[PDB]
Design a protein around this ligand. Sequence first.
Ligand SMILES: C=Cc1cc(N(C)C)nc(S(C)(=O)=O)n1
Lengths: 556, 415
Amino acid sequence: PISPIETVPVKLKPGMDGPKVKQWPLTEEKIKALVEICTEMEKEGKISKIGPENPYNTPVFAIKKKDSTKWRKLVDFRELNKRTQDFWEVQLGIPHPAGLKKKKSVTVLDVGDAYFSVPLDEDFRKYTAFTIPSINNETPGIRYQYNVLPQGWKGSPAIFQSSMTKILEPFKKQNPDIVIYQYMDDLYVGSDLEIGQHRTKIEELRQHLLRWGLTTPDKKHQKEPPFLWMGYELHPDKWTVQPIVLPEKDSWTVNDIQKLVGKLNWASQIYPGIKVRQLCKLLRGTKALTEVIPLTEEAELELAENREILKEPVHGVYYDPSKDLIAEIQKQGQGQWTYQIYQEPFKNLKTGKYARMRGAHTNDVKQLTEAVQKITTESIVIWGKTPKFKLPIQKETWETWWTEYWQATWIPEWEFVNTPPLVKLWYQLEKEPIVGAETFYVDGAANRETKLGKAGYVTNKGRQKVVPLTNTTNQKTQLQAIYLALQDSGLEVNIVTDSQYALGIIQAQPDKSESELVNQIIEQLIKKEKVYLAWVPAHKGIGGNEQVDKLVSAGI
Amino acid sequence: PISPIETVPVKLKPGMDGPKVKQWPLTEEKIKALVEICTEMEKEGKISKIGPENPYNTPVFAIKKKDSTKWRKLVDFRELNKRTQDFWEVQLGIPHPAGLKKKKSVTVLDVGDAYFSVPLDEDFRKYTAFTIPSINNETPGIRYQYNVLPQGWKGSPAIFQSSMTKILEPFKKQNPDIVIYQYMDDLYVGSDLEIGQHRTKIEELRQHLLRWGLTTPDGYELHPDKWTVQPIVLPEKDSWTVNDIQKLVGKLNWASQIYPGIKVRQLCKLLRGTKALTEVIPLTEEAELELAENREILKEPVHGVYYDPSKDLIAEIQKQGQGQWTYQIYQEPFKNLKTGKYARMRGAHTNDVKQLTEAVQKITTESIVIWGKTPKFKLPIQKETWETWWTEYWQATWIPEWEFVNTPPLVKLWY
Ligand SMILES: C=Cc1cc(N(C)C)nc(S(C)(=O)=O)n1
């Protein structure tokens, strides 16, 4: 039944008119079924047959030819959606099983006439017009428009959630011990009541909703064994996500793919590594929900990697507000980190992996910091507080790093956990120039016009080198010069540049970079026993710098 | 119960729409605090529940102001304030006293409760929407908009201007040697009186405000005398190496962007050659004089600098270690309006982020006192680090604009 609740006013974006997209014809077996499904819908108030004065149209389709799946109609609102106003999505993110507290008695109610029993803003219905295809042309097709929140329309979820909140509000006040969570058509109700009274408070809720227009069938059916909330299995002492199965086939429609991305977004919340970039590609640029879009090579590869991940189940425990959260991180091999959040040893709430990179040049200690920050924020989202950290970094390592970093850094309450490969600063810059180490004054230049450059050095001991370079830049030549000096020197060396660029990069003790050059500089830096790097203004006297400049700039 | 008196019409700047700024995640205590605060504000009609068909949003969170008291609510209206039309003569409120910066002490009163008695233009409320988040997203957000002048919105102080004048008229008759300046939710009161003499007049003013509907949270002493600039200095070693000399010339060169009268020549002289860094050099006389020369030039404040009321104020900060920091404020590069230092540690915070969040508030306050605007900040920190943590240490009812920088070797140049 359609709910008595007040509609929410809905607007088109300013300057935009309504949809005016035309119907595709077809099989007069699709037209049957459509007309059946439609008359049924019309019987229940969801839609009304209308008058041809209405100028707007959006397409209709018929899907799942039998297959033990009778038929089902399919409205393509893509065009209307782009024309309807934006909405504020209130939710910061979707709820996680580990965020749930332990409850003696739990029920999940289903909202079937979810969308199809919440009224649409009267003024807005005219824009949801569609036609069922006119077989022959002495008259047009059957016209209709929606009276409730349409399936794929941009506003249904926001408005549906809004409405569920107004409707549940009375019943919550009357019942402050009971917690209710709405998610799509799942309604989670938990309490610590005895199964006798709890089941009883539920019947009351079912009536409450019923008064407001919302049905809720004698649940039983034949799905009662496991107990599912938004795809999670909620057992008494733990939750589980059963392995997800992605369809296999080759003929993939726009609709098939739109469905796939959704089911992958739900999933990336529980599993680490789920990717959707290639699949989303296949979509925009086209039309026709039912047109077959063949999978690119990359897309095919994303799907393979996605199955491999979604291959295993996931398990976790519930949250106990009376216990600290602990989070533990391990290094996993070049930009790879794993973490476990728990409250009691070995009973995990949530586990994940961070695989990323800072910018172009980074180090394990920066990465660990960002990982700590990413985890802090997740924790606040899911539990509203921050975990105590256990990190594979010695206090002294962190102590010397944050002491000397030109940027402010911080890490919350933490303790050292001597575990996998510990997190280390791979080399250090010397504070003071080194006695009896040779001094290389390096320099580099390159013609912006021609791309040709030279990189080389000059040392206090009469040593020298100049190297001709094709297609590089002022900035690369500077780096090449420094490398030269690293190559051609002993375990101790004082280098001197006038390159702000170069000096900055080395200053931050990168142990990893996306520049081949820089990575070779690193491997050099780690061999050396003592390095001292030094900046000076270019184009000044500076006896050292002056010469290297002359030599390195015969590229004018 | 609000006042049926006419509302001032308020518009956004032409071409601009409302804020659509995402709410950041909040801790549990902050949530429970705000739900409590708002529930009460709604009963009093200060704000109203709204739904998702209102597309705008501004983040909200909660703080503890004067001496870790109890929860205050803080809406980050930086985006709405930029998008909100200006007010000409009632520009950002009133003119700014030049004599406020010259008083023995200055105290900062939180006068935000006042705004909640003027109704806000009806067509404008929608742009004031904010959404309290829920833990693990169990609930969905509680959304509200404002029915009255909101705290934090630049429109509020300007619309309440004429009421403020009238409310403070009495107190200024009885005290003409007191300077008063309103910046947003705040009242800056400065006398050159005497710590106890002065402080009684704050409680005195507070009582006067209290008898006028202006409840005031239950000061915060600051002294714009104790404000001096950080002079640039050079070392004066007994033994000078090639490196020593080399560093020095580097400093002197950068510093030639501020003072165009310094020369480095006689010192580069000394470095003629391809010497080892360790090599001690003896100074010329024509060079060793050059030093005391520049040492003097740099001993006298830069001259000819010009506050321009039309341009932004900009703030740079440098972490110097030791729990110590440095900042310059300026409008155009190298033409600095002030430079100072903020040293701490040896007390209670080994926390690097807490120290910077505190420095940002001292610099902003100083800047309010002196020019009546807040500077935009270049912050020596990664966006995610600062974003995950700053609010835990914030105690002001305002928020300056900021961006995140990439510091070079101009650190070892400010000390
Ligand atoms: C597509 C989203 C979705 C949604 C869902 N819910 C919300 C019941 N369950 C699943 S499942 C059966 O693949 O674990 N998927």
